[PDB]
Design a protein around this ligand. Structure first.
Ligand SMILES: O=C(O)CCCC(=O)O
Ligand SMILES: O=C(O)CCCC(=O)O
Lengths: 545, 533
């Protein structure tokens, strides 16, 4: 008789969250305008949350509205090391019960949270993302609603269905895999540029039975706290995700110094990821187990045009990739490679369309294509690149090039032509609305493809525009490791959960493919149980007779 | 569609026993000169080494050599030049090489790989069979299946776009570093990554060289192209230093000591700025595994299962039982039975005497380490040797099975991995079983295997909960050793490693870095959006 009895596993039907249109007179447009008004002139005081306790430290910080930095949208504080360690202790004390909860019960929290975000909370998270991170309507919509909702629903499906992955049983024994959470706590460290990423970085490990210290991005605090509150309201128990904004170095020092660290789920700069990686290595003898580091780290992404390309698609897809959300995406196109034969046509269209791009206040004017960049630091960096484009003999500014930080961190979309395919601006991630173009002779398309592949340290996203099948096949083979998300006749941004799992290798990170069915596997440490139902025999074997 | 390879019985007059006997005779008095292989080139260096037969160390079963820094760097370059074409091969075509190798190992080469594992690593017939045949064959067949099926894992496509995932090999080379104790593990450490489109420098274990090279040659004969796996025995630190110094390192597939894995981890971290991508480290690092007995246990099963787990292959398994917890009420039975069966265990030459239960330990270094523990057992106030404890390295590295009782559940012998035929027993008061379960969990730094023996359902349920993280491979009424591919994926956390569960369907995921391709079949619209108008 079987002493361990394993319950049958269920399945989950989910689909991508539909993108809304926000047409005039539509309910979502009116709801959004109301949610935007709800934020005008408001400052939210956002505490650290440990368990259910709201905690304040002396390290007071402000989040500013990028397009109106006079507006402090949130006042928050950095957790001190004492509070971080207390958060660790409380999370650890909550972990066993949470890990032992059926996967389906944990998933229900995220499915509930996804419905809330889909419906009654949509306008709120969109508005907080627009005002706090400077996103336009459609950029907030694909992010804080659609992607976050998809993460929560698809990850719940992947997780529930994962328990159906079971080993073979042969008499006289029954074999079962238990998908245990990691023993210890996970540190989640999220970036400013996507509300959805913060929710996934903290949420996915929690779904798999982990407990988490979540350090949200300073410049995305407003929307991040909104998401945190929704998770708790959806039924996430206390001490499963601790909401602990903190000084970055301080946070990293603290979590990497704890013997109970079992994972870091990170999205941000290469240098910071490498630094955490080395801190873990330094402390390796202290940990109860080997921590798992996951990092997504940015790119220098390309659109490559072949002479057979559809010109109109090249222009609109490049404009979107390069300039949406001010080019502040790890996936944004920042290098465009154009054949000489098409350059007159493409150049003309790009400059014409450029003149029609409206940069302004995304809350007050829905005609805005994109708005201010995130903060003074980003503004200063981008300014230095525009200045480099002027001084450099290999570079010439074809359009834009101006910026003004008197009201918001405003930067014109800028199009640069480089005569040098190895110019530093062709190599280094700017994270601003700065597109560099290199024109290559048609008969050197193959040599140029090799340049696309070899010029930068990154491997995140890239697109090929071509109507020639042989060329598409050739280019796809050549560029296999130049992009983890590769596009044929479409723009290099806008990966959708369950359709284009996102991530790339080289300097771009560990490529764990959040948005795909395998991502959750990083956050479980499986145990296999074999129950044998018959007495064992002798210790000897018959051949020994 | 694959199933597990049958374990043969090797009965008198059977085809397999006749074939194995011939294969053993084929190796008697033989020394194979095993070169480094880079591509198809057989390379010798001046750094000559020998592999000795553990039970007869006068027999040099192989002469090989250590690849120097320069040779290793040459092997990296050659492998890297072969990687693109190998990775571009359809998954099915790479799989075919491993399925052919599996069929070879199953049939015409079975006796050879078994004999080489017996003579070279000191395994008995059945230990070689479950290892060099069954487990290796199963790795190759199951990973092939998993990988082929992985290509069927594809994302959602919505018109007018088609999405496809390409399971790329990792860009760079993978270093595979395998242990002496399982022929199959070497085959998997180098084989699994190669299957997924990687190129590999394989540093096989000195003390398993003969069988490892046998596997290497089978892979080549089965159609593995030149420069996909380089066969590069080497000094450990030299190999580690060289591979972690290359900008092209993309993975380390390691099975061996905790401190060495930690060292490699730290070398990678120190050199992080040099690498083209973040290397993936995978490590399986041993355990201090338990058999916990409840008063309701079947004593016969406890005795036979514990004897096998503790002493098979001289206890030289990362999964071997080395701490046994017994309730006072059952101790007189279990002690009496353990001591009686002990006196019947045959230690000797496994080639010449199939009556042998287990043979010599792997080498002089192992013999010395194990003897230090026996000497500790003779010194410690809380330890008493109940049986065994003898050892003699005059002819082979022979260590008798040893049964020790500890009065201290926290004694270093209860905590530290010996990798020898040394079983320590702790007797607990029946009414303190719960406190004792907690001690099972908290005493050691490891989390690999464990067994509970009990016939009471509530006890089994309670124990399972409490030991959830004490064991990655957990057994109810069965021994802690002998995981079978596709049935009990193997590995554990805590200090026991990264727990990537080789033997299961997810292991190959560590050795692929997926790419997603989206093709859009209609021209793109305007860059503007309707809501902006
Ligand atoms: O910037 C990021 O980190 C996410 C980009 C995702 C995408 O555009 O596909
Ligand atoms: O010792 C090892 O490294 C493998 C042990 C596998 C098992 O016995 O389950």
């Amino acid at each position: 008789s079987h002493m361990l009895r394993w319950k049958h596993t269920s399945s989950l039907k989910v689909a991508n969250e539909p993108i809304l249109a926000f047409s005039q007179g539509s309910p979502e447009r009116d709801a959004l305008q109301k949610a935007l008004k709800d934020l005008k002139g408001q400052t939210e005081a956002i505490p650290c949350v440990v368990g259910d306790e709201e905690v304040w430290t002396s390290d007071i910080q402000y989040q500013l509205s990028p397009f109106n930095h006079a507006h402090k949208v949130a006042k928050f504080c950095y957790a001190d090391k004492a509070l971080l360690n207390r958060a660790i202790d409380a999370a650890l004390a909550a972990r066993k019960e949470w890990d032992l909860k059926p996967m389906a019960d944990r998933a229900q929290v995220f499915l509930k949270a996804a419905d809330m975000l889909s419906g009654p909370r949509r306008a709120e998270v969109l508005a907080k993302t627009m005002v706090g991170q400077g996103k336009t309507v459609i950029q907030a919509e694909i992010d804080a609603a659609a992607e976050l909702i998809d993460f929560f629903r698809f990850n719940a499906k992947f997780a529930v269905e994962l328990e159906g992955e079971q080993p073979i049983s042969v008499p006289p024994s029954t074999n079962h895999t238990v998908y245990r959470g990691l023993e210890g706590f996970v540190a989640a460290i999220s970036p400013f540029n996507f509300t959805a990423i913060g929710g996934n970085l903290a949420g996915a490990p929690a779904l798999m039975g982990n407990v988490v210290l979540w350090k949200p991005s300073d410049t995305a605090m407003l929307a991040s706290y909104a998401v945190y509150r929704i998770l708790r309201e959806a039924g996430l128990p206390p001490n499963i995700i601790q909401f602990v904004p903190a000084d970055g170095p301080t946070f990293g020092d603290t979590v990497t110094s704890s013997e109970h660290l079992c994972g870091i789920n990170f999205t941000g700069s290469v240098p910071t990821f490498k630094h955490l990686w080395r801190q873990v290595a330094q402390n390796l003898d202290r940990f109860r187990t080997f921590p798992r580091l996951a990092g997504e780290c940015g790119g220098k992404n390309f659109h490559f045009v072949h002479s057979s390309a559809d010109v109109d698609s090249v222009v609109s897809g490049t404009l979107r990739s390069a300039f949406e959300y001010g080019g502040q995406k790890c996936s944004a196109c920042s290098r465009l490679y154009v054949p000489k034969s098409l350059w007159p046509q493409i150049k003309g269209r790009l400059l014409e369309e450029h003149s029609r791009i409206k940069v302004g206040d995304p809350a007050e004017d829905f005609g805005t294509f994109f708005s201010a960049v995130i903060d003074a630091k980003a503004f200063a960096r981008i300014k230095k690149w525009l200045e480099h484009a002027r001084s450099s003999p290999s570079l010439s500014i074809l359009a834009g090039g101006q910026c003004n930080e008197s009201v918001g961190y405003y930067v014109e979309p800028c199009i640069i032509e480089s005569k040098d395919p190895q110019e530093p601006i062709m190599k280094e991630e700017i994270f601003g609305p700065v597109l560099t173009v290199y024109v290559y002779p048609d008969d050197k398309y193959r040599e140029t493809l090799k340049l696309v592949d070899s010029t930068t340290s990154y491997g995140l996203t890239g697109a090929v525009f071509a109507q020639d099948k042989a060329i598409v096949q050739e280019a796809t083979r050549m560029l296999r490791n130049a992009a983890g998300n590769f596009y044929i006749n479409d723009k290099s941004t806008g990966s959708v959960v369950g359709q284009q799992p996102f991530g790339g290798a080289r300097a771009s990170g560990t490529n764990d493919k959040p948005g795909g069915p395998h991502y959750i596997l990083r956050w479980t440490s499986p145990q296999v149980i074999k129950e044998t139902h018959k007495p064992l025999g002798d210790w000897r074997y018959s051949y020994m007779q």
